[PDB]
Design a protein around this ligand. Structure first.
Ligand SMILES: Nc1ccn([C@@H]2O[C@H](COP(=O)(O)OP(=O)(O)OP(=O)(O)O)[C@@H](O)[C@H]2O)c(=O)n1
Ligand SMILES: Nc1ccn([C@@H]2O[C@H](COP(=O)(O)OP(=O)(O)OP(=O)(O)O)[C@@H](O)[C@H]2O)c(=O)n1
Ligand SMILES: [Mg+2]
Ligand SMILES: [Mg+2]
Ligand SMILES: [Mg+2]
Ligand SMILES: [Mg+2]
Lengths: 231, 233
């Protein structure tokens, strides 16, 4: 009763036609799908192009969805409504690194009784970059807050923080539908961070610390960088 | 019953002997005490200093405390721990502004069943100053996080944020005791923010938004700021 859903639209703006961009001779979306199928889970691509569907068709289910859906999570919400499932992972279509254990860790955490779980890695590079999301945690590993600002403020030094949030999320289905029904919240819209809707509405997010390398492909520089890593 | 407890040790470092520092002809601590006494509440000064005691002894109770207590909240706990009260307000000794209705709002909030209550005000100037504490709230007004960093990040601007935290706290006695028994936590020590111990240990902090002006006196600059405000009411 599990699925990994991947939203991957064709109309990326910072890189032309992202899902189809070749990484070491293989389209980005195929890297993501290959890695996710190897985990043995049910994998569902949500896309708005048959050209993208045709690249991974052989490996997983694809569902076409309106191009004009305004976010990755709206695209996932749009396929999840019609899917009879209990536990969902939402995976970024531009994240070619996939680790079976993290997928497993996420699903186990949900089976323990968590409604929302996500990932974070120790990373100093992200600290002062507004495009990277930082996260701070309570003693049991629940997120206190996520921000584009450099959090925490280092009045004293530390080797654990700062953390970079990795935008992969596990949900219980009903919590994900609940999220879809809540109006956008105040800090969510200020920061441009959908995950704040959960926090602002008192939904706990379990954050798991991973050492595995993640790094999305948004720009031509990311593609060059992530190309080198995949060796 | 309830009490308001004011920790004021003599040994400030960023400004010398600050409770005794002259503020428009009155020592700083005397402003705080005079303000609090007109609330009608029981007001207690917690201090390590005979000179500090002498300046307010005519107005309120003074309790002696060890000079080596490591923070104001710890000085408050030192007297609270064998005081027969249910609810307390920890009011900073270097906060010369007092608003009776704010004191009442805090106590009412504790009477609803809150364990920890504090205040924040809209303040654009505090945003980029590390010495000032920003706070972000959930939809019910509970603190999500406090930080010296500029939070929230303004991908878009806002009418409400940013907020400056005003370091006045209401506690149920038992909650103040638990806090004192918790070891300093990780983000607390990174940020230099004791209140984070509460969040990291999963104790909810209710934050009420006040429109009243507050400003702590930590440096000579703060003292001038405060003097200018007080000459312009
Ligand atoms: N309207 C949107 C926007 C994003 N996504 C998906 O959400 C993920 C994260 O978004 P992002 O990395 O920003 O990709 P793009 O929006 O496509 O790229 P860009 O921001 O450069 O335009 C991507 O896999 C993307 O395909 C989507 O399905 N629908
Ligand atoms: N060990 C401490 C530290 C602080 N306080 C009290 O807590 C309040 C807030 O502390 P702060 O503004 O930092 O004053 P000081 O620590 O005394 O001064 P400084 O930090 O400049 O050395 C003050 O009323 C102060 O007297 C206290 O009782 N004992
Ligand atoms: Mg985008
Ligand atoms: Mg991306
Ligand atoms: Mg101090
Ligand atoms: Mg102060």
């Amino acid at each position: 009763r599990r699925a990994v859903i991947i939203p991957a639209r064709l109309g990326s703006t910072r890189l032309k036609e992202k899902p189809l961009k070749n990484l070491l001779g293989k389209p980005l979306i195929r890297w993501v799908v290959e890695g996710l199928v190897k985990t043995g889970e049910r994998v569902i691509l949500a896309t708005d192009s048959e050209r993208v569907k045709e690249v991974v068709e052989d490996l997983c289910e694809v569902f076409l969805t309106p191009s004009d859906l305004p976010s990755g999570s709206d695209r996932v919400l749009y396929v999840v409504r019609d899917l009879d499932v209990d536990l969902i992972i939402n995976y970024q279509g531009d994240e070619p690194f996939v680790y079976e254990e993290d997928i497993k860790l996420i699903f186990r955490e949900l089976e323990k009784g968590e409604r929302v779980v996500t990932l974070a890695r120790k990373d100093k590079e992200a600290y002062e970059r507004p495009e990277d999301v930082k996260v701070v945690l309570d003693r049991e590993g629940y997120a206190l807050y996520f921000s584009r600002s450099p959090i925490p403020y280092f009045r004293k030094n530390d080797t654990f923080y700062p953390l970079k949030h990795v935008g992969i999320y596990g949900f219980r289905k009903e919590t994900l539908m609940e999220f879809g029904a809540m109006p956008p919240s105040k800090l969510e819209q200020i920061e441009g961070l959908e995950q704040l809707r959960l926090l602002e509405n008192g939904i706990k997010i379990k954050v798991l610390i991973t050492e595995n390398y993640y790094h999305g492909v948004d720009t031509e520089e990311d593609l060059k960088i992530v190309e080198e890593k995949l060796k």
